[PDB]
Ligand binder design. Sequence first.
Ligand code: NA
Length: 461
Amino acid sequence: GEIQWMRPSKEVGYPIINAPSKTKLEPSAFHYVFEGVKEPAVLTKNDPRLKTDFEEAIFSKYVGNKITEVDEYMKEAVDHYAGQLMSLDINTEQMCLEDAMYGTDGLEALDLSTSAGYPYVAMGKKKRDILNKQTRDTKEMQKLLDTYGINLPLVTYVKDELRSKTKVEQGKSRLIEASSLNDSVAMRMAFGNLYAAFHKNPGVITGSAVGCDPDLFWSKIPVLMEEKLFAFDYTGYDASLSPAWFEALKMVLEKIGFGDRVDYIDYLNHSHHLYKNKTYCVKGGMPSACSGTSIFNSMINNLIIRTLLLKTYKGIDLDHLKMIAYGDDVIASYPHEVDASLLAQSGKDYGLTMTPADKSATFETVTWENVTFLKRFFRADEKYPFLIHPVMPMKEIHESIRWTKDPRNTQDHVRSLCLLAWHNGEEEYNKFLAKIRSVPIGRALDLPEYSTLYDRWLDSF
Ligand code: NA
């Protein structure tokens, strides 16, 4: 991804967009009960904690475009992945407007909580004023589609979340590029059934994990994997994607029956954004806008890994590459050992910056003991080995419980953390509950005990 130009929105006919400048994150009742070092990400250039230009820092993710066209290794990757998806017999017909709005099997309804994007954000009109879940009315939407059309600018928001001290000082805040409601709706009508098929088929055929339930999915993953695991992290995955990867994605779509609307991918590839009082054009780079976003990033990840394996290991048997991606995150395998360091080297030529799995200093062998997916380790249950626990380290949970975005959601927030934490074992879990109950807010919460969660887990299979 590369920003082509940036200038005052007024100069191109667009209004200034208002964006909050104060985080909703504040110390929780457990701020001093647990250890943590993360704090709210910088949201404005005037933040006292800054140690460098904010604007420059947030847009520095657009490192450029390393490639222009789709080479032969990419075309082969496209053929192999498309052929694989062909086995799913994905319904290729457009999804009706109602279902695209209020959902259907395999696709949840539009989030009435998120931004409606342009021009609604500037007209003060909100999703709640357009959508009606009780009636599933499409009249208001349809009228809005006819009026403002599609391919509208994406509204950029700084993401209000916790970040390390270094990232705060370096102004490395992540961005949200919200597509207009018109585009989200249009995109879901065009690819709704594709999204549904992926959501319903997490695994090594879709090569995707979007819509998965870790508590149940972890027990299924080991079986789908080949003998030798391999993995790596990406630095700024979304923004680093070159236009060629979007073209390769369109080829896949064309081959599986959606050649009909590959034009929608162009909107993601060559896109224009609104940020505050500025507008800019980006060539390449996946906008972080929705579940559609994550599915396409996942499909591209499948194309990337296949491409690097073909370029690095001529004669590789892609039919034995077993991988599952969630956006840029991935867990992969092959019958033979591969060199992640080599793959990373080939990756640079395709515009991808690949580093050792889980922040390792060097590229080390990935095993069932040290591998992580969605920040979770894999651990066989002590009593029933065939049941696999998704284990997220307590460190992350501790960091999260120390802050709140709304005192009214304390119960939900803490329960959600408990569902993640108990997998660390009964001893650790009880210590967690005892600390929570060391303050009045914690004592008033209705939280599940260990045996209750374990029984609930067994009963969910
Ligand atoms: Na883009």
